[PDB]
Design an enzyme around this catalytic site. Structure first.
Site, mmCIF file in Angstrom:
data_model
loop_
_atom_site.group_PDB
_atom_site.id
_atom_site.type_symbol
_atom_site.label_atom_id
_atom_site.label_comp_id
_atom_site.label_asym_id
_atom_site.label_seq_id
_atom_site.Cartn_x
_atom_site.Cartn_y
_atom_site.Cartn_z
ATOM 1 N N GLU A 1 -52.271 6.629 -4.346
ATOM 2 C CA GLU A 1 -51.837 5.526 -3.499
ATOM 3 C C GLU A 1 -52.515 5.664 -2.143
ATOM 4 O OE1 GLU A 1 -47.549 5.497 -3.210
ATOM 5 O OE2 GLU A 1 -47.365 6.112 -5.311
ATOM 6 N N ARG B 1 -47.715 20.541 -11.388
ATOM 7 C CA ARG B 1 -48.394 20.327 -10.120
ATOM 8 C C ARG B 1 -48.461 21.604 -9.297
ATOM 9 N NH1 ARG B 1 -44.036 16.571 -6.830
ATOM 10 N NH2 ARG B 1 -42.534 18.215 -6.280
ATOM 11 N N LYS C 1 -45.337 12.914 4.612
ATOM 12 C CA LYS C 1 -45.977 12.082 5.622
ATOM 13 C C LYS C 1 -45.100 11.972 6.866
ATOM 14 C CE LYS C 1 -48.126 7.547 6.306
ATOM 15 N NZ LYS C 1 -48.192 6.139 5.823
#
Ligand SMILES: [Br-]
Ligand SMILES: [Cl-]
Ligand SMILES: [Zn+2]
Length: 585
Positions: free
Chosen positions: A45, A271, A281
């Site tokens: 994204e 992951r 963020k």
């Protein structure tokens, strides 16, 4: 010969064309389009900077394709409408390139909105979607949810005819509903134990413009709708995501089957989780906004841009990921562990220079001004391909302030004292103390010594000569020494918040350090690549004009590289990592 690509998760992957299909005839076109070659994608994204975790997704997807002489898409997942933010798109492209990978094609999820809408009508016409007008709370209640476990049941909208659903969906498209007043839901199975089958929302009314498609759309698909269908349209042979989304593989395959399109193979790997920092963020934004760091590429952060600017070689990242391996299990890695891996990589690959952070001038009283003892020093012991350089030993030079002490009773101090001579790297004889000079503040500004040319010294220290003949020293305007940004390995668990776990000494700046004159040749010949790396499967060719490729070991000091802001006139260095793993100090 064994690497992450031929063992573990990636090794156990299916061959192209051998993944199961609901409808047998669909594989034919798949193989025709792919030519039987691997097709993967990296689908980030574009609403933020990539961090260290994404290096695994990049290496896995681009690396697997490359290994099999196939291709990998760079797909910007712009499913959701967002404000224009070009910087994220370009950064992503740079990071993919920085790690040495090449997208065969760059696409956007929004490229497929037309086809996605068509497939939505197909889904409706096949009796597998309905237009729902339930509120968010009514939807939760239908899903037995403010805690879960309750009874699950359908709303009245679920029973709607194909005709009504189709008309209402077209009315959604044409702006006859306000945002939230209508959604298209997949008609799955509310009785299923899996939340991913509880009639997932496929389309919403948003009434917001899109950077790529302008004001064309009033409705947009969800990730649940776009991910499998775009994979299908792009004929992805191996759709590789994290195990965080293992549950969604059921609905992923369901949707493909319900609209009768090629069903790609989604397979999940664990992951990479980096602990000891903050990766959200919102939290990094706080650090940047409140000036705790210089920016989003500040060397203390673990954004990929930060890691690049810090001086961490891209090949070190790739090697690190491979060593950890790839399986269905997550890799949970401490910052300290990552930094140790970088340190070892640098110790194997970097030229070694003499550099003094905090210089003190030394004068040799018993050597003439025309005395010049040329010390030839290999750029790296045991590395003939790095060659050698020469440094002139004269009657004036600089040493580290920390390499002189007046305390003659300190048995742990092995460098220069009034009672203890010191050796100089590649210089024939030791130097012995004569006298020192201090300013009014008691700071030592000059040390006089004798060259002991007519019992072995306890250590040999680096030195930078004053020699106009060889334009020595090279003066460094600014050297930025970086330590841990946080004091603890789990800053987010700090009582008073993560900002209160900040380490006050995360950036120590030294002014007017001095460097041997051969730094010029090091810069010119960067990046310095040893044969072992050149011949490894994790060699990354770097841009020779990038500042950060100028990596070196400052002997007895640490590993450094040029910062982004550096120029020939005002040299600025970043310390990549300290020389050694931590001690108790
Ligand atoms: Br993922
Ligand atoms: Cl600081
Ligand atoms: Zn409803």
């Amino acid at each position: 010969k064994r690497t992450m690509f031929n063992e573990g998760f990636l090794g156990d992957l299916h061959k192209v064309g051998e993944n199961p299909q609901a409808y047998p005839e669909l594989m034919k076109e798949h193989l025709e389009v792919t030519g039987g070659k691997v097709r993967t994608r990296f689908p980030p994204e574009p609403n933020g900077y990539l961090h260290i975790g994404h290096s695994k997704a990049i290496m896995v997807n681009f690396g697997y394709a490359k290994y099999h002489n196939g291709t990998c898409y760079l797909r910007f997942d712009d499913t959701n409408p967002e404000k224009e933010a070009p910087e994220y798109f370009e950064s992503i492209k740079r990071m993919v390139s920085w790690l040495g990978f090449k997208p065969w094609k760059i696409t956007y999820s929004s490229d497929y909105f037309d086809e996605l809408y068509r497939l939505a009508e197909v889904l409706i016409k096949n009796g597998k979607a309905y237009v729902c007008h339930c509120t968010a709370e009514e939807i939760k209640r239908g899903r037995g949810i403010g805690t879960p476990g309750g009874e699950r049941y359908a709303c009245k909208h679920r029973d709607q005819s194909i005709e009504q659903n189709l008309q209402e969906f077209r009315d959604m498209r044409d702006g006859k509903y306000k945002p939230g007043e209508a959604i298209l839901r997949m008609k799955q199975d509310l009785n299923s134990p899996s939340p991913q089958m509880w009639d997932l929302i496929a389309y919403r009314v948003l009434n917001a413009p899109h950077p790529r498609t302008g004001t064309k759309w009033r409705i947009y698909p969800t990730y649940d709708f776009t991910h499998c269908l775009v994979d299908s349209m792009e004929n992805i042979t191996h759709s590789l995501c994290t195990t965080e989304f293992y549950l969604s593989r059921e609905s992923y395959e369901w949707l493909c089957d319900q609209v009768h399109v090629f069903r790609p193979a989604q397979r999940e790997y664990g992951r990479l989780n980096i602990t000891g920092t903050v990766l959200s963020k919102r939290k990094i934004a706080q650090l940047v906004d409140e000036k705790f760091v210089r920016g989003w590429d500040d060397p203390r952060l673990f954004t990929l841009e930060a890691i690049r600017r810090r001086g961490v070689p891209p090949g070190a990242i790739l090697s690190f990921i491979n060593t950890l391996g790839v399986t269905t299990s997550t890799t949970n890695i401490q910052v300290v562990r990552f930094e140790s891996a970088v340190r070892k990589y640098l110790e194997d690959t970097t030229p070694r220079l003499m550099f003094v952070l905090d210089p003190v001038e030394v004068v040799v009283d018993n050597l003439s001004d025309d005395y010049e003892e040329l010390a030839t020093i290999p750029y790296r012991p045991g590395t003939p391909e790095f060659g050698e350089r020469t440094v002139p030993f004269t009657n004036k030079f600089y040493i580290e302030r920390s390499d002189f002490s007046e305390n003659v009773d300190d048995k742990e101090f092995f460098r220069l004292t009034p009672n203890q001579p010191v050796g100089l790297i590649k210089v024939s004889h030791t130097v012995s103390f004569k006298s020192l000079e201090k300013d009014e503040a008691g700071k030592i500004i000059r040390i006089h010594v004798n060259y002991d040319n007519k019992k072995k010294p306890k250590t040999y220290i680096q030195w930078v000569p004053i020699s106009s003949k060889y334009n020595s020293p090279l003066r460094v305007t600014e050297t930025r020494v970086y330590n841990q940004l946080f004091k603890s390995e789990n800053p987010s668990s700090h009582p008073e918040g993560f900002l209160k776990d900040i380490n006050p000494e995360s950036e120590v700046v030294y002014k007017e350090s001095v460097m041997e004159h051969n730094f010029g040749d090091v810069v010119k010949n960067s990046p310095w690549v040893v044969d072992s790396v050149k011949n490894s499967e994790f060699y990354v060719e770097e841009d020779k004009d990038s500042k950060e490729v100028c990596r070196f070991q400052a002997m007895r000091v640490g590993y450094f590289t040029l910062d982004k802001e550096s120029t020939t006139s005002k040299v600025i260095l970043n310390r990549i990592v300290s020389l050694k793993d931590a001690t108790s100090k």
